[PDB]
Design an enzyme around this catalytic site. Structure first.
Site, PDB file in Angstrom:
ATOM      1  N   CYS A   1       4.900   2.001   8.777  1.00  0.00           N
ATOM      2  CA  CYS A   1       4.715   0.827   7.947  1.00  0.00           C
ATOM      3  C   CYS A   1       6.053   0.333   7.392  1.00  0.00           C
ATOM      4  CB  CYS A   1       3.712   1.160   6.842  1.00  0.00           C
ATOM      5  SG  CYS A   1       2.060   1.295   7.510  1.00  0.00           S
TER       6      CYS A   1
ATOM      7  N   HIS B   1       0.797  -1.216   0.000  1.00  0.00           N
ATOM      8  CA  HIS B   1       0.000   0.000   0.000  1.00  0.00           C
ATOM      9  C   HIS B   1       0.829   1.265   0.000  1.00  0.00           C
ATOM     10  CE1 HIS B   1       0.438  -1.199   4.248  1.00  0.00           C
ATOM     11  NE2 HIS B   1       0.222   0.054   4.604  1.00  0.00           N
TER      12      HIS B   1
ATOM     13  N   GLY C   1       3.454   6.623   9.971  1.00  0.00           N
ATOM     14  CA  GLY C   1       4.700   6.513   9.219  1.00  0.00           C
ATOM     15  C   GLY C   1       5.578   5.342   9.613  1.00  0.00           C
TER      16      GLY C   1
END
Lengths: 306, 306
Positions: free
Chosen positions: A145, A41, A143
């Site tokens: 991921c 993603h 932030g």
């Protein structure tokens, strides 16, 4: 002496954390050999996360849109691809800080170290476990991921977890480093119910086994109980059932304490059925299921990596 | 989100982790630039540890008696010296893995990450606090002296610990990197007294604020209690006293949550008198004194409205 929730030395991993910015989104990538792994993603922005067709979203995409950078140096993608729920992208230069490593998917109840990263820079490191309902109890902010989960054996760094998102019940889910989700979960942002969670028995057994190593006898009691009455009081208090296999994994610790793996179950029944009665095992009135038996040996022996 | 005892990335330190061998004894050194720091009692045999004259032992020892190795390659000691209870070894070459760093002394109730080491090779990373009786509760087996304590602030690793020994109650004592023990202890096999220990009040106060960040208030209470009768029931429950300065560093957590430190204080006094009645704050029936308010801010982002 002493017993602490212990993480592997993050050093081999820190060198692979990089920042990836694709459009309006920024998250962390895994820079191994000459390819960067990161959550699928990255191609989609925070607004359109309800239901994107990721396969279609990538069809229009090209290499040049992705800005992958190590600390401050920027890198370009010579090939982009999507395997399961990651976006593995070949970059111009390899990472010479790449350790000996392995990709692994772990089964519920194991443990690993997490290296939290924000904008390509590690921030923190801690120790969690894959919960029997296929969640983890992490610390992940915005932030974060692509922050990874890993184990170490000798030189070798087997990665086992990559972060994707947070569930409405506070917990986190992600994939393995092949990109395959853990659990009845998916990336598309939806109401996924964090399944009910049971206590990992063998890991509670191991932490009692660190306890008598550490010199804690409070819970010790002589009378023993059948193997299957364990499975019986197990389901009653939402505990995962023991198998003979666990009895064998407890074998290595069995001789070192000098207690048969069965006898401690009985002392455990004393903890569970009578309660803690306001006292502490290894500095906790909580039964601890977040330690595996390999975890306990690594700390009472003191193995090393380099 | 979520809340975890979390350590800093140990990578910057690992590059400085090195082995020091004197005679029959091996422990770990801190290789910064072209000097290796390590506990001074590596010149010592088990015989002279009962009462050592360290000055005499060090003149008898020479450059060639010290073997500092990178777990792999050997390094050459062209100078030795003694600063208090550490041992600086001027080595032939500098370390190109040297971080930005500071030698720092921390106050009791502060926290840091420890990187446990064995034969110059890391084993683990975890989080501690210097206790008010000037100890720490670590995970240390044999061959772990010289394991360092550190924080990371932007680039530099403020160093605050070099481990020396184990106390009879299982806890640990050591020095700063200037060589001065935290606590009334010294490196001598003696009846060494582990002082009585009090609980760090400011950390628990902060730790309640991680709980309201979780948004669960079961412990929140309509009842209010004064500021200073608390300091009194503090000695009653063996807590180090709260001060106003403690409250000002705690203020930033107050304002972003909007709870006055007084009512959180009151919820605490009520909490300890009747107990938690079998419920858990942030997955622990035990109160945490090992989280600084800086730790709580480093883990909870928060915002403040005015």
């Amino acid at each position: 002496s002493g017993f602490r929730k212990m993480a592997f030395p993050s050093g081999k991993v820190e060198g692979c954390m990089v920042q990836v910015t694709c459009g309006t989104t920024t998250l962390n990538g895994l820079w191994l050999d000459d390819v960067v792994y990161c959550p699928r993603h990255v191609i989609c922005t925070s607004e359109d996360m309800f239901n994107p067709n990721y396969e279609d979203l990538l069809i229009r995409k090209s290499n040049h849109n992705f800005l992958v950078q190590a600390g401050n140096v920027q890198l370009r993608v010579i090939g982009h691809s999507m395997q399961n729920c990651v976006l593995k992208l070949k970059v111009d230069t390899a990472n010479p800080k790449t350790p000996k490593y392995k990709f692994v998917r772990i089964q519920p109840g194991q443990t690993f170290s997490v290296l939290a990263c924000y904008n390509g820079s590690p921030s923190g490191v801690y120790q969690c476990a894959m919960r029997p309902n296929f969640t983890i109890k992490g610390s992940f902010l915005n932030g974060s991921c692509g922050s990874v989960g890993f184990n170490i054996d000798y030189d070798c760094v087997s990665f086992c977890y990559m972060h994707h998102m947070e569930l409405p019940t506070g917990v986190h889910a992600g994939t393995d480093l092949e990109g395959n989700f853990y659990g009845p979960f998916v990336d598309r942002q939806t109401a996924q119910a964090a399944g009910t969670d049971t206590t990992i028995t063998v890991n509670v057994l191991a932490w009692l086994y660190a306890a008598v190593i550490n010199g804690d006898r409070w819970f010790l009691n002589r009378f023993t109980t059948t193997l299957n009455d364990f499975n019986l009081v197990a389901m009653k208090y939402n505990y995962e059932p023991l198998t003979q296999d666990h009895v064998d994994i407890l074998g290595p610790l069995s001789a070192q304490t000098g207690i048969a793996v069965l006898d401690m179950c009985a002392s455990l029944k004393e903890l569970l059925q009578n309660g803690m009665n306001g006292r502490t095992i290894l500095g906790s009135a909580l039964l601890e299921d977040e330690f595996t038996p390999f975890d306990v040996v690594r700390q009472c022996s003191g193995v090393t990596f380099q």
